[PDB]
Fold Radical SAM protein.
Amino acid sequence: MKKEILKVERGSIAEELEIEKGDFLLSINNKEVKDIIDYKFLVCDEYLEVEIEKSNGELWELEIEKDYDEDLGIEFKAAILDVPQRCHNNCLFCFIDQLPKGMRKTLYFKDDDSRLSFLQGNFLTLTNMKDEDIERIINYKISPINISVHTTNPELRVELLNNRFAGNIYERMKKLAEGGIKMNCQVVLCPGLNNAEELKRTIEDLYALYPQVENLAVVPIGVTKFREGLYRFELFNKETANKELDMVEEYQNKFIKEIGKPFVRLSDEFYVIAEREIPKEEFYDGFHQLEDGVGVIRIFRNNIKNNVKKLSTKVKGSFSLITGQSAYKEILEASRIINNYNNDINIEVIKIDNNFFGKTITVAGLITANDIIEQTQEKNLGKYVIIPDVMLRKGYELADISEQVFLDDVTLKELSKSLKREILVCDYTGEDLIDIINKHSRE
Ligand code: B12
Ligand SMILES: CN(CC[C@H](N)C(=O)O)C[C@H]1O[C@@H](n2cnc3c(N)ncnc32)[C@H](O)[C@@H]1O
Ligand code: SF4
C-alpha cells in the first residue's frame, strides 16, 4: 500500500520538505494510505506525522503543522482498489467532446470525476464511485461532497450521462444526508430535457434533504461551434432564460420565507442572457460559488464600488482592458466609474468575440491569445493591457514564464511581445484592479 509520488506542486508543503517525484508515501499519523479516500480523511488535520521512503532508500519521518484544509501538494499512484482516474460517463453535453482537435493534451482528460478531483472537492457525478466508497466517506465524515446532480429523475439522468448506474443519485444523496454529510449541488440545465417541470422536481427533491444539501446552483448549457455529430441542443435565449428565472423564483420565495435563503440560484450567465438585473449581495450569502459562475458580477461591482475611493486622484495612466462578450457591459461600466473618479485614467475596454471556440462561448476566461491579437490589430492600445486571471491556466503566479499560458498555448510573455505592450494580470473578481491601476499610473 506504499504510494509512489507522481507530482509535487510548486510552492507546496511537500516541496518545502523536499518530497520528490519517485519518493513513496508510507503512512500518515501511523495509518497506511490505502487509497484516495483514506488520504482525504487523513490529511483533514492540523498535524501530520508523515513517513516517506525516498527513491534512494532513505526513510524520513516528517512532522507537519498545517491548516486543517491545507493540501500537502502531492499526487500519488492509484491503488489497485481506488477511486478511478476518469469519469465513467458520456454526457450529452460533455465539454471535452466539443473541443476542437489539436489543442494541448491535458485539455482532453476526462478527469472531472477523478480521484484528484474528489480530493480537490470539485463537483462529482459519483457514477464511478462504489457504494462502499460512499459508506467510507460517511464513516470518515468527509464533508462536504459536491455533486453534479442535473436531475433526480433516474431514467433522465441515465439519458443525460449515459452511465447505467446514474439513476442512483438521489438514493445516494439520501444516504449521504442520513450520514450527516453536507452537499453542494449543481445542475447543467438543457432546455427541453431537464428544465421546467423536471427542474421543479429536482429542486423539490434536493430541498427535502436540506440542511444536508445546502444549496443548488443551476448553470446553462454552453456549446462551442464543434458539435458536428453530437447531440443537438436548444440553447437558452432571452425569452426562455426569463421564463426559467421566473419559474425558479417561485421556489426561491418559498425558501426565503422558510429558511431565509434562496437555496437554489441560477448562475450569472442566465441573468446576462435574460437581460435581468443582478441580485443584491445578500442573495449570494457570502459569495461561496464564484468559481462556478454564481455571484461574480455582483462581487465585481462591489469590489469596484468599494475600491474606487482608493484610486489616487493625482496620477495619470492609460489602460486597455480585455474581456469577453458576457462581461463587456460590466467591465465597460467599471471603466466609466474609474474614469469619472479620475479622468486622467484613460481606459478602454475591448470586447473579444470567441472566434476560436465559436461565439456561443462568451465567458472571459475562454478568450485565446490568437483572438486577442487578431481583434486588436486595428486598435491603439493603452500603455498597459490588463487581462483577468481566468484567461490563464491555474498556477500562473508561481509558474515559469513558459508555463503562463492561454488556452491556445501562447504564453503571457509572447502575447506581450505581439501586442508591444506590458500585460498586467488582475483578479477576475475585481479585487485588485484599482490597486494595479494606482501602481501603474504616473504623477
Ligand atoms: C461556465 C463555464 C464554462 C461554460 C462556458 C459557457 C459560455 N457561455 O462561455 C462551459 C462548460 C462550456 C465551459 C467550458 C470550458 N471551460 Co470553463 N468555465 C466556466 C466558469 C465555471 C464560469 C464562467 C461564467 O459563467 N462566468 C460568468 C460571466 C458573466 O462572467 P465572466 O465572463 O466570467 O466575467 C466576469 C469576471 O471574469 C470579471 N472579468 C471579465 N473580464 C474581465 C476583465 C478585467 C480586466 C477584469 C478586472 C475583470 C474581468 O468580471 C466579470 C463579471 O463582472 C469559469 C470559472 C471562472 N472562474 O471564470 C470556467 C473557466 C473559464 N473554464 C475553463 C476551462 C479550462 C474550460 C474548458 C477549456 C475545459 C475543457 N477542458 O474543455 C472548456 C472550453 C470550452 C468547451 N470545451 O466547451 C477555465 C479557463 C482557464 C484558462 N483560460 O486556461 C476556467 C477559468 C475555470 C478554471 N478551471 O480555471 N466553461
Ligand atoms: C464548469 N467546469 C468545472 C468548473 C470549473 N473548473 C471551475 O472554475 O470550478 C466543468 C463542469 O461543467 C459541467 N459541464 C460539462 N459540459 C458542460 C456544458 N456543455 N455546458 C455547461 N456545463 C457543462 C460539468 O459538470 C463539468 O464537470
Ligand atoms: S462527467 Fe460528463 S462532462 Fe465530465 S468529462 Fe465525463 S462525460 Fe464529460
